[PDB]
Amino acid sequence: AKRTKKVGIVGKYGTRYGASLRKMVKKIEISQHAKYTCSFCGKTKMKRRAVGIWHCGSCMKTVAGGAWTYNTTSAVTVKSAIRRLKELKDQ
Amino acid sequence: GKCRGLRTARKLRSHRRDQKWHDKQYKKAHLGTALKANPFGGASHAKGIVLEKVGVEAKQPNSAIRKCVRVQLIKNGKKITAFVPNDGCLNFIEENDEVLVAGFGRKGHAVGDIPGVRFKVVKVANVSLLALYKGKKERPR
Amino acid sequence: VRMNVLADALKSINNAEKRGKRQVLIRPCSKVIVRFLTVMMKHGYIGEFEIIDDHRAGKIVVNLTGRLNKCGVISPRFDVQLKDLEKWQNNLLPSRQFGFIVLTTSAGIMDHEEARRKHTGGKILGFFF
Amino acid sequence: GRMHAPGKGLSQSALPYRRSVPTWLKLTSDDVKEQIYKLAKKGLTPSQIGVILRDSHGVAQVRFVTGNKILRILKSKGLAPDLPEDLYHLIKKAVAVRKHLERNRKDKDAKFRLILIESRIHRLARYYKTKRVLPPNWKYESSTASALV
RNA sequence: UGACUCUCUUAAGGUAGCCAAAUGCCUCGUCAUCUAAUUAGUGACGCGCAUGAAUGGAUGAACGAGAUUCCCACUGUCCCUA
RNA sequence: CCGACUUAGAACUGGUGCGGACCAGGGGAAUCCGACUGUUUAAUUAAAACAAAGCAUCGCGAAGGCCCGCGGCGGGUGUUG
RNA sequence: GAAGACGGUCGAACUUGACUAUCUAGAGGAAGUAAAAGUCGUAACAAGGUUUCCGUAGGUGAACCUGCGGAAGGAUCAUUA
RNA sequence: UAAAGUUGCUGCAGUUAAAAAGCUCGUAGUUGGAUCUUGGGAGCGGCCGUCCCCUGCUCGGCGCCGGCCCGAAGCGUUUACUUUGAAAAAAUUAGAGUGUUCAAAGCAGGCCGCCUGGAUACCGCAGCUAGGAAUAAUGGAAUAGGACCGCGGUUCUAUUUUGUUGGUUUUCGGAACUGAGGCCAUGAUUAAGAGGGACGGCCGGGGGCAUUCGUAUUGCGCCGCUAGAGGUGAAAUUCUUGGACCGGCGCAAGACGGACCAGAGCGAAAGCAUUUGCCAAGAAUGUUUUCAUUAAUCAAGAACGAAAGUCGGAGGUUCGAAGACGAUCAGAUACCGUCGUAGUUCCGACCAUAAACGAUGCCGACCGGCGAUGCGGCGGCGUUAUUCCCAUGACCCGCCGGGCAGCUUCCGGGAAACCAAAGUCUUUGGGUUCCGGGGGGAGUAUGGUUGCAAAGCUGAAACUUAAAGGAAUUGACGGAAGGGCACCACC
RNA sequence: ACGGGGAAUCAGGGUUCGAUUCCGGAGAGGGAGCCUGAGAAACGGCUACCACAUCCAAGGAAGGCAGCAGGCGCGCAAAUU
């Protein structure tokens, strides 16, 4: 069954810390504990080891990603932007 | 009506029933909030004890003192302004009298000059206020 | 969408009568329209028509006179008993002299006069006067 | 008027009155069938077959030359698609739109046009189940539809 | 009672809130409530000696060997001692 | 044929006695303060004090900010940015 | 074969709690409506002297003012290569 | 209760008087295209109206020579519908007979013992019954498990039979099951000026992502020459010999996408306008493609939803709620002016409202004209470009389909303003949704619910009140626009 | 709100009423339990408890008009022991 109405992962914090700080923490807590599709093997096995370091359980391939997510919104724009400066330098 | 289909009786009936509440004469009668507020409690007439004599100012166009009576009912203990009709009939009405009180005509709406005076005095101590006026009876004291 | 083919035909011939057209086209033909039209014709409120026969819902070209005041449908098809037919023709026909309620009985599509003689009611189709 | 648009467009094919075989065509009913079985083998929908037929072969309608129409011919041999050919393309169009929203969550109109397509799949499904041409336990499933292209 | 007006006057004249609060001298404030009786308690009222906005204001579920008041239950705290 | 711990229900029964010792939350309606857990005057104050997360200011791009040292091409922050 | 008694049974009834409908008190607060002639202004109606109005914000003795976006119920059916 | 067609099934309204959800999706609900039996016979009163017929297979007679008809019963896609028969307390209602002296009533009475009443109709639905077979549902054979045939066989096995005695399978009769071949014209209506889907060339400020440009504005670096600049109804605050404003070069940032730009296009609405690329979508047209009713409208439910607002991150050029000042003023916490916070911008979540307006729900039918326009297609002299033709663009003359519109008129409507839709409405019924019921109180209180909040959705009553309101008319008025006249105006 | 037969108004639809003499149901102050009998959960039968009230020589006893009359109360509202 559905156990909690509107808390999720952050039901573990009980009444502590404030509703907004529990809400803000929830969006992170889901993403950092989520399993992601390994770009190298396709297996949903990219689990966060520590901060910024993600590890495929099957490939045994480590990726330097974001704190709470695999990709940071910024580093995805930078990889696009660096690649377009690369296409202009190379001509 | 709008929906005409041969198998549309429950919508036409339930629509007519739902939209009947938006009528004033219906919702007043069929929710008992009017009857709970009606000082007579659905009765045509009611008896009550005269406890003072109020000189009600008429509406702006007609400037004159309408000599009414504050009546308290035997059945409710609810207080009421009742318009004493005629020229000098108030003289036959003294404090602590079982006067028979009726509505004025508009089924619980204030009539003509008198503001918020929905009732009138019919009898005084089981003797008609018309008979006292005509001089066919006298006030038993 | 088109949910009474008889209704979208009776109105089509009625708009042409109001205007004074000498013949009218009514795009979908049904056996129900043809049977309605033939009943109007035996009383003589229209001239002879011809059903144009495509390999579809046919068309009809009705030769209009100027005798037809109004040709009107009744939707839905209210089932009529003989004891209730007098009340219909009270408040649907102009006078008790002229005008006809047609209604689909078991004995075939026919006017209330022919439906009285056979002592057999049915579902009301429409009317004309 | 359309299902999922305000368009009231009058634009469809208009068959000729006469349903006879035209008196120039050298194609017999048996040779039109052997030609559909040649085309259906190629991975070609009943719609695409009938186009190729009236274009480069002069057979106007298969229903007029033969007795049966094209899907009713495919099916009697056993070359017909399992789920119908129109339902296939709606499921195909939904899977296309959903792959577009895998990168474009900002696209509110692709999300809106998805619901209209998704609605039409669940609307033909409740038709194709009453005709017993889909199995009763057929469900449209966004997760697994991509492999049923 | 004073929306309004007149004058004096500042760098700006205390806004939103809150209150005889752990902040109110007068004071056991005034009204209500709780009592048989309440300088106590809570709820209100604010010309507030001397409230008030990160010298943070107002709130506030959960929490507390925190500070109060009342009720039920309990009882040698007491009647009144053995 | 080997069973090993329970659970529910019933009958009867005792001087209404049975979690029989032991173990083992009094409760409710409210106000004030501090969100909470944490900490604190060892030897009179465990608190409303401190801390805390959150919040917000400030400094500094290293020849720098902050800081140490009697001293130095000294030292901490700094295996830092 | 009487009283009477164990147990079962139906079960009034009072006791306590809970829920529910109805009626009603209340310091204080904040609204509505009705008055023949209260105070302050003049918001609206004429381009009503700042066009009006709508939604949403914030502000102001008060009507109201102002930001943003809409509307014509406008004070323009029109503005000329 | 009628009046009240002011509850509207009959039968009301919803552009402006009260009223169409901001928008689309969507399940119940409601509603759904056309299509399958007609043609003749045979008698009837004067070319004409009328009765009658277009099932099948054991009992008994008008019987007749193992064959023939008529009649009693069991039977046969079904329901809705209609008609019929039944059963359906009286009293009451309707109504027959009837001088209560009349009448309300009563069921009595009437003839010179006799005679006669105390009927009948109606009794919503639902149920039973016998026709009718139009209408509206509904059914069959499509991996033929197919109707109709006799054949081959498999078994439990009536009783018609082997003198009375016993047994067997037997013939024989039904019940269920298989192996065959034969047979019917062997079986599938149509392809909606319904819909979906394919396809073709297109089209569009449709949507998203990245990219690119443009000037302006602001700030800055420097270089000039200088005393003012700026702002206004008039000023002032404000900038300014510490060089302002101005002029010139650069540089930086963040906005915005002028003119072209239209009563033009696109989108469900909100909305959408620099270049180019990428992504999926879409209407319309074209169609001798495909499926074959899949549809329309929709309680509940769901997507989107301007601006403002809220939350977190980046940014902050301009403008600019609040705030500060300068004015104006009696006041001016306003309009005007100078500054300036949140906001305005972007990313990701919330909010779900607008005069979200065409104040006009959607689908379908029909009912005048005209010239345009946008899009696709079709055809038709000729000009022009790629010139070197062919096919294509650009014009030109139409036609057709959808589209935003416009003018026109006694289609008609409407209280009118106005409306080819607001028409086809007392001559009232195409389908369906939402919603109004005098004005206030009030979109209030209350409860529920959604949201971080703001608030959104749902939503009373007491009380009050004779009007509020719509359209149009005439005057009067205007700090509206025009046109006059006058030495009681001016020049 | 006992239901129905019906009633009032009524063009055609309807709308409203039906405690009320006929039919059916229910109940006898509130519930509950029973006895007798073919038939009762009977009340002009019984037994309990509750409410109400009666006579008493204070130990006890006795009650049930929503039967017909009548009284009191309630009321705008209704008859002769």
Closest by Cα among D79, D47, D50 to D64: D50
Beta bridge partners of D42: none
**Do the beta carbons of residue B120 and residue B103 sit within 8 Å?**
yes
| Closest residue, chain C, to B3 (C-alpha) | C76
Q: CA-CA distance, D52 to D36, in Å (whole number)? A: 10
Asked if strand F comes closer than 7 Å to A16 Cβ, the answer is yes
- How many Å does it take to go from CA D94 to C1' H282? 14
- How many Å does it take to go from CA A7 to C1' E60? 20
What residue spans define the domains of chain D?
26-80, 81-149
Strands (E), A1-91: 36-37, 44-50, 53-56, 62-64
CA torsion sign for C12, C14, C18, C20 is positive
What DSSP letter does each residue of D87-133 carry, written as one string?
HHHHHHHHHHHHHHTTT-SS-HHHHHHHHHHHHHHHHHHHHHTTTTS
Q: CA-CA distance, D72 to D33, in Å (whole number)? A: 11
- Which chains have 3+ CB pairs within 8 A of D? C
Lookup: tokens for C104? 């689909």
Residues of B with Cβ-Cβ distance to C77 under 8 angstroms: 6
Which domains, and CATH codes, for chain C? 1-68 (3.30.1370.30), 69-129 (3.30.1490.10)
Closest by Cα among B79, B78, B58, B71 to B99: B71
Report the protein residue whose CA lies nearest the C1' of nucleotide H288.
D60
Asked if strand F comes closer than 7 Å to A52 Cβ, the answer is no
Chain C closest-CA separation from residue D45 CA (Å): 27
Is the pair C, B in contact (3+ CB pairs within 8 Å)?
A: yes
Residues of D with Cβ-Cβ distance to C54 under 8 angstroms: 17
**Do the beta carbons of residue C102 and residue C89 sit within 8 Å?**
no
Chain C closest-CA separation from residue D47 CA (Å): 23
Closest by Cα among D52, D23, D24 to D36: D52
Interface of D with C in 88-117 (CB under 8 A): none
**Do the beta carbons of residue C17 and residue C68 sit within 8 Å?**
yes
Q: Is C89 exposed, middle or buried (0-12, 13-18, 19+ CB in 10 A)?
A: middle
- Which residues in 78-107 of chain B line strand I, with CB less than 7 A from it? 100
Annotated binding residues of A for Zn(2+), as ranges?
38, 41, 56, 59
**Which residue reads 């004291």 in tokens?**
B141
Q: CA-CA distance, A65 to A67, in Å (whole number)? A: 7
**Do the beta carbons of residue B140 and residue B92 sit within 8 Å?**
no
Which 3 state secondary structure label does DSSP give B77?
coil
**Do the beta carbons of residue C82 and residue C101 sit within 8 Å?**
no
Angle between helix C31-43 and C7-19 (nearest 10): 40
C103 DSSP 8-state letter: E
Task: Determine the Cα angle at D113 with ends D110 and D116, to 5°.
Answer: 155
C3 phi/psi in degrees, rounded to 5: -115, -5
Is the minimum CB–CB distance between D17 and chain C shorter than 8 Å? yes
Chain B closest-CA separation from residue C75 CA (Å): 7
Q: CA distances (Å), B136 to each of B94, B132, B141, C40, in order?
A: 20, 6, 16, 79
- How many Å does it take to go from CA C72 to C1' G6? 91
- The method recorded for this entry reads cryo-EM
Question: Which CATH number is D81-149's, of 1.10.1420.10, 1.20.1090.10, 1.10.287.10, 3.40.50.300?
Answer: 1.10.287.10
Closest by Cα among B40, B53, B34 to B97: B53
Which 3 state secondary structure label does DSSP give A73?
helix
Residues of B with Cβ-Cβ distance to C76 under 8 angstroms: 4-6
Is the pair B, D in contact (3+ CB pairs within 8 Å)?
A: no
Angle between helix D70-77 and D29-40 (nearest 10): 70
